[PDB]
């Protein structure tokens, strides 16, 4: 695998979004992994519909939460997912209004990175592109992040409370890290992003719930 990868400079990542009040993190993590795979497939970068997921993945909890693997699974069974244009985000629960003429992409399943295995996650990002991850994002130091390669001993790898996207990896100043896209708005952290300590015993649970869709 390369020493460092950044799918932002490669045109794989769409703008940073804002979930707002709805617990749709998972949706934004899923949609982001889907957009990375669509780009690699058709050469076009499109914004996919997290609302489509929130209203339609009956296996999940809408704005109450859900899993990324369930969302890849719904897109696979359903044979598609709409674009953001065709199914705009509202931020609250509404009935499924999935429209097939607005189908922007399809999924052929998903792969799960070996739990707790960072090297594996690295190879996955390096060979696949953006990867859906789940971390502990409850710590104040994480929420007030602005610069640096985030790290805190209090981070709990079994307290996975927020779904995010692994956009690449590298090194800052001798500190290895993961480029993480957040769904808190371009005004949070470092233009919507945060570099999180890599190889530090799977800090904040970075590799405990990683997965990517097949396209
Ligand atoms: C996000 O917006 C909503 N939370 C969830 O989806 C979690 C799962 C994620 C993989 C981390 C969750 C909570 C409760 C239930 C379920 C669920 C799963 C399957 C089926 C039904 C329900 C999933 C959270 N991000 S946040 O709001 O920004 C946040 C919250 C807390 C701490 C930090 N950040």
Domain ranges (residues) in the chain: 1-215
| Total count of residues recorded for the chain | 215
Query: 67 C-alpha to center of ligand 1: Å?
Result: 8
Distance CA 34, CA 28 (A): 10
Ligand 1 surroundings by CB, under 6 angstroms: 19, 23-26, 60-61, 64-67, 134, 137-138, 160-163, 209
Ligand 1 center–CA 94 separation, angstroms = 18
Residue nearest ligand 1's atom 22 by CA? 66
The CA-based dihedral angle spanning residues 88, 91, 94, 95, taken in that order and rounded to the nearest 10 degrees: 50
Q: Dig out the tokens for 77 from the structure.
A: 């069974």
**Ligand 1 center–CA 76 separation, angstroms:** 22
Give the residues across from 111 on adjacent strands.
212
User: Ligand 1: which atom is nearest the Cα of residue 61?
Assistant: 21
Whose tokens are 């590298």? That residue is 170
CA angle 118–67–198, rounded 5-degree value: 20
Architecture category of domain 1-215 in CATH: Alpha-Beta Complex (3.90)
3-state secondary structure the chain: CCCCEECCCCCCCCCCCECCCCCCHHHHHHHHHHHHHHHHHHCCCCCECHHHHHHHCCCCCHHHCCCHHHHHHHHHHHCCEEECCCCCCCCCCCCCCCCHHHEEECCCCEEECCCCCHHHHHHHHHHHCCEEEEECCCCHHHHCCCCCEECCCCCCCCCCCEEEEEEEEEECCCCEEEEEECCECCCCCECCEEEEECCCCCHHHCCCCCEEECC
Method used to solve the structure: X-ray
Ligand 1 atom having least distance to the Cα of 24 = 2
Ligand 1: residue whose CA is nearest its atom 5: 65
Phi, psi of 130 (to 5 degrees): -50, 140
Structure token pair of residue 71: 């969302």
Q: Is 63 a catalytic residue?
A: no
> Which of the following is catalytic: 56, 162, 177, 202?
162
Annotated active-site residue 78? The verdict is no
Using only the alpha carbons of the chain, give its radius of gyration: 16
* Catalytic annotation present for 162: yes
Instruction: Report the C-alpha gap between 146 and 91 in whole angstroms.
Output: 26
């Amino acid at each position: 695998a390369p020493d460092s990868v950044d799918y932002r400079k490669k045109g794989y990542v769409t703008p940073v979004k804002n979930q707002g009040q709805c617990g749709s993190c998972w949706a934004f993590s899923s949609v982001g992994a889907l957009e990375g795979q669509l780009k690699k497939k058709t050469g076009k970068l499109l914004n996919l519909s997290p609302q489509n997921l929130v209203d339609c993945v009956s296996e999940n909890d809408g704005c109450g939460g859900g899993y990324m693997t369930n969302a890849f699974q719904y897109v696979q069974k359903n044979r598609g997912i709409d674009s953001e244009d065709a199914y705009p985000y509202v931020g609250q629960e509404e009935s499924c209004m999935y429209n097939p003429t607005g189908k922007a992409a399809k999924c052929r399943g998903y792969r799960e990175i070996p739990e707790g295995n960072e090297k594996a996650l690295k190879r996955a990002v390096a060979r696949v592109g953006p990867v859906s991850v789940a971390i502990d994002a409850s710590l104040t130091s994480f929420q007030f992040y602005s610069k640096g390669v985030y790290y805190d001993e209090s981070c709990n790898s079994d307290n996975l409370n927020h779904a995010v996207l692994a956009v690449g990896y590298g090194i800052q100043k001798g500190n290895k890290h993961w480029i993480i896209k957040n769904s808190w708005g371009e005004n949070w952290g470092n233009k919507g992003y945060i570099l999180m300590a890599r190889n530090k015993n799977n800090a904040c649970g970075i590799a405990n719930l990683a997965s990517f869709p097949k396209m």
